[PDB]
């Protein structure tokens, strides 16, 4: 076939949509930052920190995405896990899109060299007022585009839009993201479950039951396999590729979940839905929750449609 | 205080031991293979497989799955070290006997790309290696690999995760080296590393719960429902041994792969998964048990023999063994 | 100044026009190709050919640029040093642009690891006829965009358009061309002359005097320095950065010059003229020569204005 | 099958019944070459030009210096960057003297032309304490010499008693790969290399030799001219393709420009070990007895029949 790169793809989609080119420039600018995060995560230059010539990853990742999006002339408001407040882009470098991002998700346990990621979500400013944090408090339903970069065994960018979910592998030799999986869809039912079972004594009765139904199948089926990496980008990527269910529900330390709706839960929910999968808080869809805080936390149960539905049936047999 | 590379370290250690060079050349040939596996695992040249020059079919055997390419890289690099007689791998049913002209003294049992079953999900993967000496007089055979893990000369792993790190355990201790992909050199980042006495993380597939033996079932409940009114232990299971055991060494805690049903003598293979990681653990002040015995004290009968494995922080493995000893009989 | 990339620059400049989007894809396809050539010229994977798993550069350069420009859906006619006849692109992948390129200029001496390059010149199909070789026989004054890629100590793409000349360094760590020099303009007069002096016997009288005026200055000033790599991309790039003059004039073996108008002479003349410099054949401007063959050779004297005008004064005296 | 520099230096040291110090020195120096290559190809350039908001000759020196000191194999280190010999601290002192040029050609690195790292290794003459006199040895006493070319691709050329061996860097895995074994030069070439901008300040012998190549007296083809202005590149071309490289003596530079210890001597050893020659006009570069660490020497090196022809013309004018 002829090589389809991210750059050719984002240009072709904008040209067929006869668009301005601001969405294309955002995604190009974001992927140049993802390439730079990947170089830094794989530790290029570590010899210079250890004295080859005689002589931050969280922050650098944020500084890379921030600077690359501000110089895009395509963003107005930027929300980062790292920045406690929204960034309002200077007037002269302003564009029509609001971007909610998590620069290096999983960096908590990056000392063990566990898979880390960049989670992103793009909205349009619908308001007529001056750029403010309020332009970022849109429900996931209004997402123009979303996705994640995985810095695992190789680096991959998953781009979810209305065309579908597209998977691009970084070729470090040329710095190009090669489309390796087009219009990807999730399995209707998987065989893997993912959650921290260390919060067992703190779990909701409904979670406790669903987990025991996978370990000890009532329908005399095969017991599910357990996988929990501790990095949402890695756990959710395996959920898209292999199928199954990722859960981060309420515990006690975190009674509204740990994971953050705007730049963790909402982007992943958009990827899942566009890939024929589901994503709930237990009560509603992640994409239907209207936010009040940029750093608001939210429960997430995402994956293979039938597996999310099975969970929801247990929640129903326990709640309102 | 001053910089060091894997190459310099292994060459200086061999001169300090006034040695032949065979171990030093083996370890350098193994590390050249590890930089090559890293380049391919990070998908360098994938553009050529997707028509950047418009040519796929079967090109330069780059259509090989990364577990075959990894094995072919480790096998050809080790054979050309002039340091190997017998080579055991996860990919080859019978041991490889190295042609007389390239034969050396060491037996290597290795796992070329551990976790490759799920490499579609871009899971952290690794090369696990264990180096033994031929203590036999008979013509090189598979029996030369059937040595217990106490007889090991050196052992360790390459993790292909966020970054690529070689962990090389010897009698000098465990040394951790980071691959700088800019210069193609492993940089000594962590020296004579020691595992924590007690951790706060447990790692096992709890989807095998209905088949878990009572000792595993109790120990797990002790970490979720602690007696001491302590914080419950956290759960991490990547599903790649290299990744889970690396986290056990850096953060502390316990990695368990027990048995019963499906794989009933454990799953993980003793010669090229369990023993390598047990030597790293024991050289870092950690522990590695099958429950009944220490992994390193198991005398192997087959090269693809499996073993049960509970490894990590000394106090954590000892707590498990107390629970096991109550249910042992 | 804020950071810019080649891909960002080309998308911003192409957004300015309503745009078909074809020229932006063409330039981004040429960008991807140049990074591929750069990797292969720096000898990435050579260990595979020498036994790592125990299991061309000029041709591979041509195949990459040909395939990348065919799959841009923006090219109709492709002329290359490598192919004797022009390439007429398949109807389904056809666009409005005619690209004339030298895929790896200097690769005759690439065994000594000499600096090499990719020279490119993009024209618009101006005919209503079926795409043909004749669509490449446009004068250099009709160039829409031109430039080169130098694979030397580092890889740089120099892109010339109406907006002027912009120089972008490839950061191989991230695989991105970083804009390092904006709206570049050449020095008025330099201190370096560039030509193969082994042809002194077959040299035109005027070149003989110009070189004798650089070695033995008439203004009792400092003699010029001589640099000649034998790769045009290297010599013209030095001419642009440090100033001076590059000459490949006529001789006996090459009475109409050696370097090729369409994919060597014209592309480099556009970059020089967009940077406030000059490029002459002696008789006329390189860009004003109407091509008759796609492999037509042309004499070239390019560089710093005062230097090319001093040569032109001696040409008028002879 | 696969021969790397690591396996080469280890095998050659075992064939020499050696300690392992020189092997360590060459592994350490080759780590520094890889790190210079990364910097020279501008990896990270994006961090300088603002991708996240918020020297090459000095870096090259610092890399080579620290890698040679941490090798525990050096006692005296002479660089072009330091006016005084560096006496390695007693706690990492070894038995070898290294004279090196960290980035030869860096004057003109802004034009992205080929650059290099030139090196020469001697053994300490002393049995007492190390001094600059342990570096003031003639090139005959060299144990190992060579150069790293950062051109189209990165190559380390290592010359020893075993001969001259060429290693290509695979940037993908960071290994130097044996690609040309016991290399030897052409008996006669067809390329001459010199800055002809010094034509008025030239010796009558140099004037004649250059005229014999431009205007052949034997009705042979006139020779070609190549002068990159980076010695590493010009001498590598001379080795791979043949011919002559001349940085001769002017009346403005009576002892030449290029430095005996870390430019002329190292390249004279490579030429001699490849069946070529290297003269100052009066004597062999390797036979000259150094009196100053930054001493300049004239250098005419390359294919044997070409340097001999020069010497015949030098004799006529002596
Ligand atoms: C999947 C649909 C899509 C994809 C990409 Cl990549 C796009 N890029 C641009 C652009 O203008 O750059 C647009 C049009 C956006 C607008 O006008 O609503 C666009 C639409
Ligand atoms: C830490 C101990 C060690 C480490 C390395 Cl890296 C070594 N390399 C070699 C070698 O001979 O190459 C030896 C000695 C071998 C022998 O004891 O038989 C050796 C010993
Ligand atoms: C010379 C200034 C320029 C630069 C770039 Cl990068 C351009 N890109 C595009 C484009 O639309 O692709 C155009 C307009 C011509 C078309 O319609 O093809 C364009 C013009
Ligand atoms: C081919 C000549 C050579 C090459 C290498 Cl690579 C060497 N390495 C070592 C060493 O000391 O390891 C020596 C010893 C000879 C000395 O003392 O100069 C040696 C000799
Ligand atoms: O450690 P826990 O409680 O199981 O939660 C891990 C979760 O926290 C996260 O790391 C997010 O937080 P960090 O970016 O600070 O690491 C998720 O990637 C991941 O799902
Ligand atoms: O899926 P399970 O049964 O939990 O087993 C996981 C184990 O299998 C392994 O992947 C080994 O198998 P592969 O090398 O074939 O993938 C271990 O690294 C890992 O601990
Ligand atoms: O060796 P000469 O006669 O000076 O010609 C050199 C010229 O030929 C070229 O090398 C072009 O030919 P190639 O593309 O075949 O190498 C120019 O790059 C250079 O200016
Ligand atoms: O420009 P000139 O006078 O011809 O000198 C060029 C010579 O100087 C050098 O550049 C050495 O000087 P630098 O190391 O300062 O660049 C040689 O590489 C080269 O042979």
- Alpha-carbon distance of D24 to D9, in angstroms, equals 8
The 3-state DSSP class for residue C3 equals coil
- Alpha-carbon distance of A121 to A137, in angstroms, equals 12
Tokens standing for residue D7: 């396996």
Per the annotation, the verdict on B159 as an active-site residue is no
Which of residues 147 through 176 in chain A touch B, CB cutoff 8 A? 150-156, 169-174, 176
Per the annotation, the verdict on B61 as an active-site residue is yes
Residue A53 to residue D31, Cβ atoms within 8 A: no
- Nearest-CA residue for atom 19 of ligand 2: B14
Tokens standing for residue A173: 């030799």
Q: Across the interface, which of C3, C43, C197 has its CB nearest the CB of D169? A: C43
- Alpha-carbon distance of C308 to C275, in angstroms, equals 14
CB atoms within 10 A of CB D309: 16
Q: How many whole angstroms from A149 Cα to the centroid of ligand 5?
A: 16
Residue D62 to residue A47, Cβ atoms within 8 A: no
Per the annotation, the verdict on B101 as an active-site residue is no
Q: How many whole angstroms from A96 Cα to the centroid of ligand 2?
A: 64
Tokens standing for residue B1: 């205080």
- Alpha-carbon distance of B181 to B41, in angstroms, equals 13
Ligand 1 contacts CB of residue A147 (under 6 A) = no
Catalytic residue among B273, B282, B296, B316: B273
* B95 burial type by CB count under 10 A (0-12 exposed, 13-18 middle, 19+ buried): buried
Ligand 6 contacts CB of residue B267 (under 6 A) = yes
3-state secondary structure chain B: CCCCEHHHHHHHHHHHCCCCCHHHHHHHHHHHHHHHHHHHHCCCCHHHHCCCCCCCCCCCCCCCCHHHHHHHHHHHHHHCCCCEEEEEECCCCCCEECCHHHECCEEEEEEEEECHHHHHHCCCEEEEEEEEECCCCCCCCHHHHCCCCCCCCEEEEEEECCCEEEEEEECCEEEEEEEECCCCEEEEEECCCCCCCCCCEEECCHHHHHHCCHHHHHHHHHHHCCCCCCCCCEECECCCHHHHHHHHHHHCCEEEECCCCCCECECCEHHHHHHHHHHHHHHCCCEEECCCCEHHHCCCCCCCCECCEEEECHHHHHHHHHHHHHHCC
Residues of A in contact with D32 (CB under 8 A): 52
Query: Is the separation of the CB atoms in A44 and C172 below 8 Å?
Result: no
Residue D31 to residue B182, Cβ atoms within 8 A: no
D299's enclosing H/E stretch is strand D299-302
Cα diameter, chain D: 65
CB atoms within 10 A of CB B285: 15
Task: State how beta strands A155-161 and A145-151 pair.
Answer: antiparallel
Q: Which ligand 1 atom sits nearest the alpha carbon of residue A27? A: 6
Query: Is the separation of the CB atoms in D119 and D145 below 8 Å?
Result: yes
Ligand 8 contacts CB of residue D247 (under 6 A) = yes
Q: How far does CA A75 lie from the centroid of its chain?
A: 19
Which of residues 71 through 130 in chain C touch A, CB cutoff 8 A? 71
Choose among B275, B281, B310: nearest CA to B109.
Answer: B275
- Alpha-carbon distance of A114 to D179, in angstroms, equals 38
Tokens standing for residue B238: 């990547």
Tokens standing for residue A37: 């995060």
- Alpha-carbon distance of D134 to D97, in angstroms, equals 7
Judged by a CB distance cut-off of 8 A, whether residue D29 touches chain B is no
Residue D65 to residue A45, Cβ atoms within 8 A: no
Among the bound ligands, name the one nearest to the CA of residue A18.
Answer: 1
Choose among B26, B185, B166, B186: nearest CA to D174.
Answer: B185
Residue by residue, DSSP assigns A22-48 as HHHHHHHHHHHHHHHHHHHHTTTTHHH
Residue D35 to residue A52, Cβ atoms within 8 A: yes
CB atoms within 10 A of CB A133: 15
Sheet containing A176-181, strands listed edge to edge, beginning at the edge strand earlier in sequence: A87-88, A75-80, A94-105, A116-124, A145-151, A155-161, A164-171, A176-181
C96 belongs to an annotated ligand binding site:
yes
Ligand 1 contacts CB of residue A165 (under 6 A) = no
- What are the Cα distances from residue C289, in Å, to C262, C280, C310? 10, 10, 21
Q: How many whole angstroms from A256 Cα to the centroid of ligand 5?
A: 14
Choose among A102, A101, A30: nearest CA to A64.
Answer: A30
Q: How many whole angstroms from D264 Cα to the centroid of ligand 5?
A: 60
- Min Cα–Cα distance to chain A from D109, Å: 20
Residue by residue, DSSP assigns chain A as ----BHHHHHHHHHHHTT--SHHHHHHHHHHHHHHHHHHHHTTTTHHHHTTSS---HHHHHHHHHHHHHHTTT-EEEEEESS-SSPEEP-GGGEEEEEEEEEEEETGGGTTTT--EEEEEEEEE---SSSS-GGGG---GGG-SEEEEEEESSSEEEEEEETTEEEEEEEETTTTEEEEEE-S----SS-SEEE--GGGGGGS-HHHHHHHHHHHS-TTS-PPPEE-B-S-HHHHHHHHHHH--EEEE---SSSTT-SSBIIIIIHHHHHHHHHTT-EEE-SSSBGGGPPPS-TT-B--EEEESHHHHHHHHHHHHTT--
Ligand 6 contacts CB of residue B104 (under 6 A) = no
- Alpha-carbon distance of B45 to B74, in angstroms, equals 20
- Alpha-carbon distance of D177 to D173, in angstroms, equals 11
Residue A63 to residue D52, Cβ atoms within 8 A: yes
Residue A52 to residue D44, Cβ atoms within 8 A: no
Strands (E), C208-285: 225-226, 245-248, 278-280
What residues does A121 pair with on adjacent strands? A100, A146
Tokens standing for residue D79: 């660089």
Choose among C265, B103, B182, C52: nearest CA to A52.
Answer: B182
Secondary structure letter of residue C82 according to DSSP: S
Q: How many whole angstroms from A23 Cα to the centroid of ligand 1?
A: 6
Query: Is the separation of the CB atoms in C106 and C116 below 8 Å?
Result: yes
Query: Is the separation of the CB atoms in B3 and A51 below 8 Å?
Result: yes
Residue A226 to residue B238, Cβ atoms within 8 A: no
Pocket test for ligand 6, best of B126, B240, B269, B308 (most atoms within 8 A of CB): B240
Rounded to 10 degrees, the C-alpha dihedral B180/B3/D115/D119 comes to -140
D103 belongs to an annotated ligand binding site:
yes
**Phi, psi angles (nearest 5°) of residue C209:** -75, -45
Q: How many whole angstroms from B293 Cα to the centroid of ligand 8?
A: 70
- Nearest-CA residue for atom 5 of ligand 8: D229
D268's enclosing H/E stretch is helix D265-273
Q: Which ligand 3 atom sits nearest the alpha carbon of residue C11? A: 6
- Alpha-carbon distance of B261 to A222, in angstroms, equals 12
Catalytic residue among B27, B90, B204, B321: B90
D262 belongs to an annotated ligand binding site:
no
- Alpha-carbon distance of B60 to B74, in angstroms, equals 18
- What are the Cα distances from residue D297, in Å, to C8, D98, D99, D256? 51, 19, 15, 5
- What are the Cα distances from residue D153, in Å, to A244, A248, C59, C155, D57? 48, 50, 17, 11, 19
Residues making up the annotated binding site of A for substrate are 105-108, 196-199, 227-232, 248, 258-260
Per the annotation, the verdict on B190 as an active-site residue is no
Q: How many whole angstroms from D262 Cα to the centroid of ligand 8?
A: 13
Pocket test for ligand 5, best of B234, B237, B238, B251 (most atoms within 8 A of CB): B234
Strands (E), C14-143: 75-80, 87-88, 97-105, 116-124
- Alpha-carbon distance of C301 to C317, in angstroms, equals 17
How many CB contacts within 8 angstroms connect chain B with chain D?
Answer: 73
CB atoms within 10 A of CB C264: 28
Q: Is C276 left (phi over 0), alpha (psi -120 to 50) or beta?
A: left
Ligand 5 contacts CB of residue A232 (under 6 A) = yes
- Alpha-carbon distance of B133 to B84, in angstroms, equals 9
- Alpha-carbon distance of C52 to B92, in angstroms, equals 19
Query: Is the separation of the CB atoms in A195 and A307 below 8 Å?
Result: no
- Alpha-carbon distance of C144 to C133, in angstroms, equals 18
- Alpha-carbon distance of C104 to C232, in angstroms, equals 11
Sheet containing A300-303, strands listed edge to edge, beginning at the edge strand earlier in sequence: A225-226, A192-194, A245-248, A300-303, A278-280
D132 belongs to an annotated ligand binding site:
no
First to last CA, chain A: 53
Mutate to test the interface with A, among B120, B122, B257 (most CBs of A within 10 A): B122
Experimental technique: X-ray
Residue C15 to residue A7, Cβ atoms within 8 A: no
Which of residues 165 through 224 in chain B touch A, CB cutoff 8 A? 165, 178-183, 185, 187-189, 202, 205-210, 223-224
**A93 contact partners, CB below 8 Å, separation of at least 6:** A70, A71, A72, A73, C2
- Nearest-CA residue for atom 7 of ligand 2: B14
D226 belongs to an annotated ligand binding site:
yes
Q: Across the interface, which of B5, B29, B35 has its CB nearest the CB of D173? A: B35
Where chain B is broken, by preceding residue (C–N > 2.5 Å)? none
Query: Is the separation of the CB atoms in A97 and A26 below 8 Å?
Result: yes
Per the annotation, the verdict on B91 as an active-site residue is yes
Query: Is the separation of the CB atoms in A40 and A60 below 8 Å?
Result: yes
The 3-state DSSP class for residue C246 equals strand
- Nearest-CA residue for atom 9 of ligand 4: D13
Q: How many whole angstroms from B267 Cα to the centroid of ligand 6?
A: 8
Pocket test for ligand 6, best of B66, B111, B117, B211 (most atoms within 8 A of CB): B117
D278's enclosing H/E stretch is strand D277-279
Per the annotation, the verdict on B113 as an active-site residue is yes
Where chain D is broken, by preceding residue (C–N > 2.5 Å)? 54
């Amino acid at each position: 076939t002829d090589v389809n790169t991210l750059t050719r793809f984002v240009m072709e989609e904008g040209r067929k949509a006869r668009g301005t080119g601001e969405l294309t420039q955002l995604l190009n600018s974001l992927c140049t930052a993802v390439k730079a995060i990947s170089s830094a995560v794989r530790k290029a230059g570590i010899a210079h920190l250890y004295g080859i010539a005689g002589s931050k990853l969280d922050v650098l990742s944020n500084d890379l995405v921030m600077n690359m999006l501000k110089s895009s002339f395509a963003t107005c408001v930027l929300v980062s896990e790292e920045d406690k407040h929204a960034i309002i882009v200077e007037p002269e470098k302003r564009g029509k899109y609001v971007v909610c991002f998590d620069p290096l998700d999983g960096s908590s346990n990056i000392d063990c060299l566990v898979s880390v990621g960049t989670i992103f979500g793009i909205y349009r400013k619908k308001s007529t007022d001056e750029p403010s944090e309020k332009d970022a408090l849109q429900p996931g339903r209004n997402l123009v585009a979303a996705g994640y970069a995985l810095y695992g065994s190789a680096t991959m960018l998953v781009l979810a839009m209305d065309c579908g979910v597209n998977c691009f592998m970084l070729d470090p030799a040329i710095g190009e993201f090669i489309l390796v999986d087009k219009d990807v869809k999730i399995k209707k039912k998987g065989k893997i479950y993912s959650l921290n079972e260390g919060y067992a004594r703190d779990f909701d009765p409904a979670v406790t039951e669903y987990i025991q139904r996978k370990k000890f199948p009532p329908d005399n089926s095969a017991p599910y396999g357990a996988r929990y990496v501790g990095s949402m980008v890695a756990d959710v990527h395996r959920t898209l590729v292999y199928g199954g269910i990722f859960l981060y529900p309420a515990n006690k330390k975190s009674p509204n979940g740990k994971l953050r709706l705007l730049y963790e839960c909402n982007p992943m929910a958009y990827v899942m839905e566009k890939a024929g999968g589901m994503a709930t808080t237990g009560k509603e869809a992640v994409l239907d929750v209207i936010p009040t805080d940029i750093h608001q936390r939210a429960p997430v149960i995402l994956g293979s449609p039938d597996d999310v539905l099975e969970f929801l049936k247990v929640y129903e047999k326990h709640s309102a």
